[PDB]
Design an enzyme around this catalytic site. Structure first.
Site, short mmCIF file in Angstrom:
data_model
loop_
_atom_site.label_atom_id
_atom_site.label_comp_id
_atom_site.label_asym_id
_atom_site.label_seq_id
_atom_site.Cartn_x
_atom_site.Cartn_y
_atom_site.Cartn_z
N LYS A 130 -9.02 34.90 13.33
CA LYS A 130 -9.28 33.75 12.65
C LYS A 130 -8.03 33.23 11.89
CE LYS A 130 -14.16 34.16 12.30
NZ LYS A 130 -14.22 33.70 13.66
N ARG A 136 -14.46 49.54 5.11
CA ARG A 136 -13.09 48.89 5.44
C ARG A 136 -12.35 48.54 4.29
NH1 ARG A 136 -15.59 44.01 8.95
NH2 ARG A 136 -16.36 44.04 7.11
N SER A 172 -12.45 39.61 14.44
CA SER A 172 -12.34 38.19 13.44
C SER A 172 -10.97 38.01 12.86
CB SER A 172 -13.50 38.48 12.43
OG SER A 172 -14.82 38.09 12.95
N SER A 217 -16.35 34.63 8.14
CA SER A 217 -16.11 34.97 9.32
C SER A 217 -17.10 34.18 10.52
CB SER A 217 -16.50 36.62 9.55
OG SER A 217 -15.37 37.29 9.44
C1 CTJ Z 1 -15.18 39.11 13.81
O1 CTJ Z 1 -15.08 40.35 13.57
C2 CTJ Z 1 -16.71 38.71 14.03
N1 CTJ Z 1 -17.34 39.29 15.10
C3 CTJ Z 1 -18.47 39.10 15.75
O2 CTJ Z 1 -18.82 38.03 15.63
C4 CTJ Z 1 -19.11 40.03 16.52
N2 CTJ Z 1 -18.25 40.68 17.59
O3 CTJ Z 1 -17.02 40.06 17.95
C5 CTJ Z 1 -16.57 40.64 19.11
C6 CTJ Z 1 -17.82 40.04 20.30
C7 CTJ Z 1 -17.12 42.18 19.01
C8 CTJ Z 1 -15.38 40.40 19.54
O4 CTJ Z 1 -14.86 41.18 20.11
O5 CTJ Z 1 -15.03 39.30 19.00
C9 CTJ Z 1 -20.21 40.52 16.25
C10 CTJ Z 1 -21.42 39.80 15.93
S1 CTJ Z 1 -22.62 40.84 15.78
C11 CTJ Z 1 -22.15 42.14 15.77
N3 CTJ Z 1 -23.05 43.16 15.64
N4 CTJ Z 1 -20.78 42.15 16.43
C12 CTJ Z 1 -17.22 38.51 12.74
N5 CTJ Z 1 -16.80 39.55 11.70
C13 CTJ Z 1 -17.58 40.03 10.34
C14 CTJ Z 1 -17.13 41.10 9.65
O6 CTJ Z 1 -15.78 41.45 9.65
O7 CTJ Z 1 -17.70 41.79 8.67
C15 CTJ Z 1 -19.00 39.48 10.25
C16 CTJ Z 1 -19.77 39.59 8.86
N6 CTJ Z 1 -21.17 39.98 8.76
C17 CTJ Z 1 -21.64 41.07 9.77
C18 CTJ Z 1 -22.86 41.57 9.51
C19 CTJ Z 1 -23.71 40.99 8.76
C20 CTJ Z 1 -23.46 40.06 8.05
C21 CTJ Z 1 -22.23 39.36 7.92
C22 CTJ Z 1 -19.94 38.74 11.14
S2 CTJ Z 1 -19.17 39.23 12.61
#
Ligand code: CTJ
Ligand code: CL
Lengths: 230, 228
Positions: B50, B213, B47, B95
């Site tokens: 972004k 984190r 993420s 995100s």
């Molecule tokens: C960025 O880090 C986003 N990541 C993703 O959406 C997920 N994986 O990204 C992958 C596919 C691994 C990639 O390589 O890009 C993802 C969705 S679900 C899961 N178990 N992994 C979003 N980043 C953040 C964060 O940094 O915290 C999220 C915030 N969040 C997480 C969990 C619950 C509520 C809110 C969402 S993902």
């Protein structure tokens, strides 16, 4: 359009002070205040005027960017944070009169008054603004609708950064007019929520310096009362 | 130029975690990590991408500004904060992956790659913790090959936390698809007369550990007289 909320007066009396608080719901566009006549009542802007000043310094090229340094002239003053180098961001932060006076001098009163007149701000200070008037200027700034570069407005808006957390952002400026009775202290800015923005302007009677904190305290007790901030 | 304060590892162990923290002192042009190896190890940016993505979307005009609303498509995804209209600021704070996917579809894999390669970002696209800092230092200094307006607005959208002591601008990453499942936090802290860039990644065995984190980072900033 401006509803009155007497129930806010307890916050001033609990701290044994007098003042006005003006809220503006941007999505709904309703005003809320504890006292209208003082809301529309105009006072000196003391340092809440460092906001439009900074716009003019920037847009006229007296200030290159927020990183440009304005060295200390070497004269120890009675505010220690003033006895150091500063950029626009730190100068706004500690309200460094010496620095903004060196803007006002590189810019001239003629441009000032005309530029501030374009902003529809008022009417040494020079002008008089009410809290309500103070909120209409703030909304223009929020929306980059003042007739100066978007760069200027974005830079000033960055320099107004006071507090941010997972729940809100506050962009504001303190003031204290203490040459004319009554002496009165200012806090104007806005609170940024996820899906709404609340403008505020408060001023209150400030005979001491010892109650300045109530400027932010009394305002924040209102924003909690209205569930605006947790 | 790159030094290893191994004593920071107690902060990972104290939560029985493993990761790297990478700090760059700007005024002194000298950097610090708890692990020289893992600092330069490349990972999916998930993420944290972004930031450049926002730069590219702004600078090509796909996003007009931080106010523009990207309406929610209607799919009730697992993550609740996605299921709503967002703008650039809220999209970044939560995100919101699907908002940025529509950016991509709009821009094209072509222009996206070219720019990302003009940012000197990655090396299937990977970036080390030390590499994040180099990129962030160029954004902080308005030196990436996109307009100044673009870089300012992204820096506004990264705003995380601010008081009268410090300002933090950062972006989190959560990546799970391939192993390990790791967390990101990259950004900087703006002091009165200095700024401190930071990039941390770690092992995210569980989802619960997400708040570690920021927590592990702050213990290192706190331990370093950077924040109180
Ligand atoms: C960025 O880090 C986003 N990541 C993703 O959406 C997920 N994986 O990204 C992958 C596919 C691994 C990639 O390589 O890009 C993802 C969705 S679900 C899961 N178990 N992994 C979003 N980043 C953040 C964060 O940094 O915290 C999220 C915030 N969040 C997480 C969990 C619950 C509520 C809110 C969402 S993902
Ligand atoms: Cl900001």
């Amino acid at each position: 359009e401006w509803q009155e909320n007497k129930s806010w007066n307890v916050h001033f009396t609990e701290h044994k002070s007098q003042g006005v608080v003006v809220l503006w719901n941007e999505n709904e566009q309703q005003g809320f205040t504890n006292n209208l006549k003082r809301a529309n009542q105009a006072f000196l802007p003391a340092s809440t005027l460092k906001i439009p000043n900074s716009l003019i310094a920037l847009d006229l090229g007296v200030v290159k960017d927020e990183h440009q340094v304005f060295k200390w002239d070497g004269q120890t003053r009675d505010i220690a944070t003033w006895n150091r180098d500063h950029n626009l961001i730190t100068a706004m932060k500690y309200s460094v009169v010496p620095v903004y006076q060196e803007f006002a001098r590189q810019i001239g009163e003629a441009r000032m008054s005309k530029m501030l007149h374009a902003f529809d701000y008022g009417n040494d200070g020079g002008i008089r603004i009410s809290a309500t008037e103070q909120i209409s200027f703030l909304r223009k700034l929020y929306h980059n609708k003042l007739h100066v570069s978007e760069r200027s407005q974005r830079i000033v808006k960055q320099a107004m950064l006071t507090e941010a957390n997972g729940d809100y952002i506050i962009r504001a400026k303190t003031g204290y007019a203490a040459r004319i009775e009554p002496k009165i202290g200012w806090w104007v800015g806005w609170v940024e929520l996820d899906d709404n923005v609340w403008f505020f302007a408060m001023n209150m009677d400030m005979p001491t310096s010892d109650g300045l904190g109530l400027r932010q305290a009394i305002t924040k007790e209102v924003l909690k009362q209205e569930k605006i901030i947790p």
